[PDB]
Amino acid sequence: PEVSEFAFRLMMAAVIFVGVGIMFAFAGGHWFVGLVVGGLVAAFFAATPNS
Amino acid sequence: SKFYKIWMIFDPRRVFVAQGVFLFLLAVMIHLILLSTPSYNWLEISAAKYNRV
Amino acid sequence: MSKFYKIWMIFDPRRVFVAQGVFLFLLAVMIHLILLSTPSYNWLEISAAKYNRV
Amino acid sequence: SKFYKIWMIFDPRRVFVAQGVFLFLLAVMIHLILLSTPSYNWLEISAAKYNRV
Amino acid sequence: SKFYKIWMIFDPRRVFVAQGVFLFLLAVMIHLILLSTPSYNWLEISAAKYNRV
Amino acid sequence: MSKFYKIWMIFDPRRVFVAQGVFLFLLAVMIHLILLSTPSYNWLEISAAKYNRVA
Amino acid sequence: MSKFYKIWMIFDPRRVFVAQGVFLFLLAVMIHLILLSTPSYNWLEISAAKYNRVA
Amino acid sequence: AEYQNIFSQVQVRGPADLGMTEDVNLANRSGVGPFSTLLGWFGNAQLGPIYLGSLGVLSLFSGLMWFFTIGIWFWYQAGWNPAVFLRDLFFFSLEPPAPEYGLSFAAPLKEGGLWLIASFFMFVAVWSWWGRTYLRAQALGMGKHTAWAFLSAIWLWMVLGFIRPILMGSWSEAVPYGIFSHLDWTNNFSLVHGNLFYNPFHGLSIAFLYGSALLFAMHGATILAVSRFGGERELEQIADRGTAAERAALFWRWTMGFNATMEGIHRWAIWMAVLVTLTGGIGILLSGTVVDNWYVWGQNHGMAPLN
Amino acid sequence: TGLTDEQAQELHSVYMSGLWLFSAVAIVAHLAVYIWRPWF
Amino acid sequence: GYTGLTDEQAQELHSVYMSGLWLFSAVAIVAHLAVYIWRPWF
Amino acid sequence: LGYTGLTDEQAQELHSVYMSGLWLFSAVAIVAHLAVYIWRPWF
Amino acid sequence: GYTGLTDEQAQELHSVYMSGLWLFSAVAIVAHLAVYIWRPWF
Amino acid sequence: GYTGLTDEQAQELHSVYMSGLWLFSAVAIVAHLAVYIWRPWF
Amino acid sequence: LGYTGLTDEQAQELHSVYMSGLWLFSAVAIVAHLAVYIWRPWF
Amino acid sequence: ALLSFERKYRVPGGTLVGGNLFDFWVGPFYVGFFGVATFFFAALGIILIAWSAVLQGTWNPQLISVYPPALEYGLGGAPLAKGGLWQIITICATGAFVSWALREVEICRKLGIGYHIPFAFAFAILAYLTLVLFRPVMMGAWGYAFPYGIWTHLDWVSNTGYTYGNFHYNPAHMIAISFFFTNALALALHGALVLSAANPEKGKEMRTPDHEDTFFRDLVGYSIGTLGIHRLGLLLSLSAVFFSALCMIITGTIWFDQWVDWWQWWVKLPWWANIPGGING
């Protein structure tokens, strides 16, 4: 109940990764397209924690 | 009913980010579910309606 | 609501704009791909059938 | 409008670099999509048109 | 126009290096795409024209 | 075009010439190997068939 | 091309000569191995076929 | 749920450290590169400078030509198609000559002749780099431990590609230049030689490869455990034994009965990893030249139930 | 803990106003779909 | 106020941001209208 | 008002140049799309 | 500004840079003209 | 001037580089002409 | 000028020796290629 | 039996279980509650291995093999002569390992050092429990575990590896092998660097950490630092084990065909699955 900014940033990135991955796996014809787009956005989101 | 102490105990930025992502993902998944089912697949039903395929 | 302006008091405008740009581009790309995925609304396929490209 | 003030908030160097990469990647993505389709592959179109194969 | 001011924002050293790398890779990518296709593979088609095989 | 000498005010000649020397050789090797790869323009094989050096 | 000698006003001779020797040796080996690769121009095999050293 | 010192919780960025100047020719040393915050979380953020001398140039030229030659053959195998190049990148391979040609250099350029050229470039590249490790240590006046630790790696590298093919009298025994090919070469190596698991020297190398992971997990955790006493500064602990060196000594003394020093643990570290390839080179060298089937060899040496 | 009572209360008022607007549009869309294609 | 923005600056920033939002939404409506004329999805 | 340290008048001129490029870039794009539609329409 | 180039330096740098750009594009146009004559792609 | 070279030195450096470039191009033209005669690729 | 520290006369002398070696290397190379072309021409 | 500095650190406390009941040293070893469990499980496990040699009928240490129960017994008990002993030894081995990790925890608290070492050891245990417990339970047979023999647990590796063709194509395996190779590379470099800085050329002074960073910056242009390399050593080892545990827990549970067949998904991507040329088509 005392998550830091980095802890919350990672948790949202995992949620974003799963969410966006499913989004572009449906949109694209392959699951890899979701993995790439979901991974890149989550990595970009988790690498920029506001502080 | 107060519902304003939550902004005092929690970080407002965390709350807004969490709500924004969850609702957007929820709204996105529902749209994907409708496109998956043959019913309510508005793209397919409109194509049949106007004799596309 | 006219009090929405206060959202910028707590959210850094730089952080939001970058987040907005990525989100809008991602949303726009996904919708375009969904239209392309379906045999209908694939405007490239639509024109080819219309003008008998195959 | 007052869109000029967006440069009061964004670093011009980073934006131009991001825009430069973005436009090139978008241009590549579109050009590859055209080549992917059986139509609009202008290389394939010319070969069939002029009987190169 | 007044495009010369982009050099006030962009370091000439970085841009020219980035451009030099960019132009060569673009030139290489385009040339390979043509070499890949059976048409425009100017080595292949000249051999066919003069019956080298 | 007459002001192209201004490039040496920006680029170090030592860095450029090393970069160019590597670039030119790697380009020249890439072109020469492309010709050797093709059934034609493989000048070694061409003269061998020309002079009946196969046997 | 008289002004060519100016190249040493910028290039360090130690660096160039080391690069020169490395380049020429690696280039010389690459060509010799390329020639030995082709069945023709393999001067250790054309003489063997010429004098029938190997059956 | 406390600070485990795995990642730095704060970064400080002072001026770039240009390094010592014992006998290093500063002309051959380059300038300082960027500072990476992403690297700064784990270790140092500063990149560069890097020394580039005569052996550095020879290492890069041969290293580039080795890398370039594999790439051109990778493009030729792709038909110069960038899409095919990325699709079959791992499945590309610069195979060595066929077994018929033996050790002869008469292989066609597209049938093994190119591999000999690429292999020559790698050979020069690696050996020139080994001297570079030797000379960099000599320049700063340090020990040649890296040079001889590297020579352990070269021994396995020489055996796989150069020495064992000579003894087998065929370049076909060497390693192809590819991601999946040199994996397939590895698997085909065991199957031909009868379950390379029963190679005693291959088993030893796995012991030291497992042990290197064991020792570095042990050593890395130990120093991070005693990093709260400034134990990461191992050189000062060797010079002037602080409390971190004593606690690190005592933890393993009370755990497994014996311990090491702050300097003697790194002797275990170097020998644990050196034997990985040292025993590896002998293990591969014997295969085929001395033992054509290790499981049959294992049976006759009481390692398998039969015989 | 960063915000006081008045700041948090005004923040909540802004949030609910946005929430009511979001809900109202959601109702309008749901009605339009049911008019176009009923499910219930 | 984490951002250190003043009340007036937030209002001015929001006014410009909404102006861009309406400009963006206006183009999207025109683009959607063109597609529906070309190919309705209802 | 001081996120980037850029003067307000500097932002006005920087944006004016930036929009000039944006219209110039989009003008060529329109000419490019026009030729493609004439050559091969996608509607 | 960021790069420390004076406005006269920027104009001179841009002038020669555009001279190179048009020189580069001029050869590219001739190259595309030659290829289209030899083998058109439309 | 990032490199620190004066304009006269750059003018000299360019003059040698362009003289080298034209000589390199001149041999390359002869090389391409000789190959085209021996085996044309168009 | 200052990148190497050499003077014009030193560079002139240094280049003169370097070209002397280069022409000797080139001359031996030309003789070598002629021997190959006489013994086994590749054109 | 004490080092020249050991005395001042021998104080009570830090125990998890037992207090001062087992808080004593046997020679250099510290006993603790979990050390008593350690010794019992270790001694019992060793004896049953020796007794299993008697039942097997061989005394050659390399031929000694405690095979797990056959696939017919599933995940139930087995006769001691035909699998039952292996289950007892595995329970003894599991008890010995976890007791050893928890004994290290007591030594950590007594010395006031971090718990990186027992946390590092726990990764090995979960790697061990993956092979003998987690994977066999998912596959529903103790026979999928490996025998407790020097050269028969290699037969298990070879047989399990070749069940799925060339096991090299396991993607989690490729990650772990790269980590294992990288860790050994780091250890050789790290060990050699400190010795070079501590045992330099004869007569020259002992080097400083700056020479260590100077050497590797002159070598590869980057020095990770004394803190970084030990962080790197810990993470490289744990990642290697984590992916090795992952590689097996997905094999025979989520993937069943040859692992080379898995890699065709990349070749069969929509935008280049049908382009001619290359290796695949």
Ligand code: BCL
């Ligand atoms: C089906 C496959 C076979 C098998 C076949 C082989 C074969 C064949 C070999 C090994 C070898 C090894 N095997 Mg086995 N192996 C199998 C099963 C296993 C298992 C297991 C749990 O099943 C394990 C843990 C191992 C473990 C190991 C290692 C201990 C050992 C390699 C050490 C090393 O670092 O090599 C990798 C390191 C090198 C080769 C050294 C490289 C050094 C040079 C100098 C690096 C140059 C870099 C170059 C220029 C690139 C530069 C790039 C730029 C820097 C960017 N094997 C089964 C039985 N194994 C090797 C060995 O020595 O065996 C005795 C070997 O040759």
Ligand SMILES: C/C=C1/c2cc3[nH]c4c(c3C)C(=O)[C@H](C(=O)OC)c4c3nc(cc4[nH]c(cc(n2)[C@@H]1C)c(C(C)=O)c4C)[C@@H](C)[C@@H]3CCC(=O)OC/C=C(\C)CCC[C@H](C)CCC[C@H](C)CCCC(C)C
């Ligand atoms: C996760 C990263 C690495 C990692 C980590 C760490 N590892 C640690 C530590 C850390 C950090 C410690 O702190 C601790 C220790 O103190 O170190 C000195 C430990 C230890 N690492 C051991 C061995 C080791 N680490 C391996 C792997 C890695 N380690 C990975 C790579 C491997 C292999 C195979 O790769 C081996 C063999 C022991 C020496 C020691 C436990 C002693 C024990 O538990 O004693 C109690 C057990 C016994 C005395 C054995 C006899 C009794 C049992 C019941 C008999 C069981 C029989 C057995 C099942 C038979 C199998 C036969 C076989 C042929 C099929």
Ligand SMILES: COC(C)(C)C/C=C/C(C)=C/C=C/C(C)=C/C=C/C(C)=C/C=C/C=C(C)/C=C/C=C(\C)CC/C=C(\C)CCC=C(C)C
């Ligand atoms: C799978 O689902 C499918 C794809 C089928 C259907 C999709 C469903 C869903 C869930 C879609 C999602 C829709 C959503 C949530 C859309 C959201 C859109 C938004 C929020 C758009 C906002 C746009 C705003 C823009 C473009 C603003 C632009 C602003 C400017 C141009 C000016 C900015 C400059 C400023 C403020 C200057 C700074 C000021 C000062 C004083 C310094």
Ligand SMILES: COC(C)(C)C/C=C/C(C)=C/C=C/C(C)=C/C=C/C(C)=C/C=C/C=C(C)/C=C/C=C(\C)CC/C=C(\C)CCC=C(C)C
């Ligand atoms: C899957 O989707 C497919 C691919 C099918 C279809 C694609 C869909 C999508 C999502 C498409 C996205 C399109 C978008 C977002 C396009 C955006 C385009 C924009 C905004 C382009 C902007 C271009 C701007 C340019 C080229 C500006 C150039 C400016 C200059 C060269 C001058 C700069 C110099 C300055 C400012 C000098 C500085 C001045 C001073 C006073 C210091």
Ligand SMILES: COC(C)(C)C/C=C/C(C)=C/C=C/C(C)=C/C=C/C(C)=C/C=C/C=C(C)/C=C/C=C(\C)CC/C=C(\C)CCC=C(C)C
């Ligand atoms: C998949 O897509 C395919 C490949 C199928 C089709 C391709 C699509 C795409 C994405 C194509 C992209 C094309 C682009 C982005 C082309 C851009 C071209 C440009 C902007 C080229 C610029 C060339 C400029 C040159 C060559 C300039 C040369 C200048 C000089 C030689 C002089 C330099 C010296 C200076 C500036 C001296 C400095 C002055 C002072 C006073 C210090």
Ligand SMILES: COC(C)(C)C/C=C/C(C)=C/C=C/C(C)=C/C=C/C(C)=C/C=C/C=C(C)/C=C/C=C(\C)CC/C=C(\C)CCC=C(C)C
């Ligand atoms: C895949 O694509 C394929 C390979 C199929 C086709 C290839 C496509 C591409 C991408 C081709 C690219 C071609 C390019 C970019 C060619 C560029 C060539 C250039 C720029 C060559 C320049 C040559 C210059 C030379 C040889 C200059 C030599 C100069 C000297 C030896 C003298 C140096 C000494 C100096 C300057 C003294 C300095 C003086 C003072 C006073 C300091």
Ligand SMILES: COC(C)(C)C/C=C/C(C)=C/C=C/C(C)=C/C=C/C(C)=C/C=C/C=C(C)/C=C/C=C(\C)CC/C=C(\C)CCC=C(C)C
């Ligand atoms: C794949 O492609 C294949 C392999 C098939 C075909 C290959 C194609 C290619 C890319 C070929 C490339 C050829 C090139 C670039 C060849 C270049 C040759 C050169 C430039 C050779 C120069 C040699 C120079 C020599 C040997 C000079 C030696 C000089 C000396 C020994 C004397 C030096 C002494 C001095 C300066 C005295 C010091 C002076 C003072 C005042 C202290």
Ligand SMILES: COC(C)(C)C/C=C/C(C)=C/C=C/C(C)=C/C=C/C(C)=C/C=C\C=C(C)\C=C\C=C(/C)CC/C=C(\C)CCC=C(C)C
């Ligand atoms: C677009 O990409 C470009 C073209 C720009 C560049 C890309 C290049 C690429 C994609 C490179 C890829 C390289 C790869 C995949 C390399 C993989 C290497 C691997 C996995 C190697 C594994 C083992 C190799 C060994 C053990 C090699 C040992 C070699 C030796 C010991 C040297 C032997 C020496 C010999 C045969 C000398 C023979 C010659 C004479 C003259 C006696």
Ligand SMILES: [Fe+2]
């Ligand atoms: Fe250490």
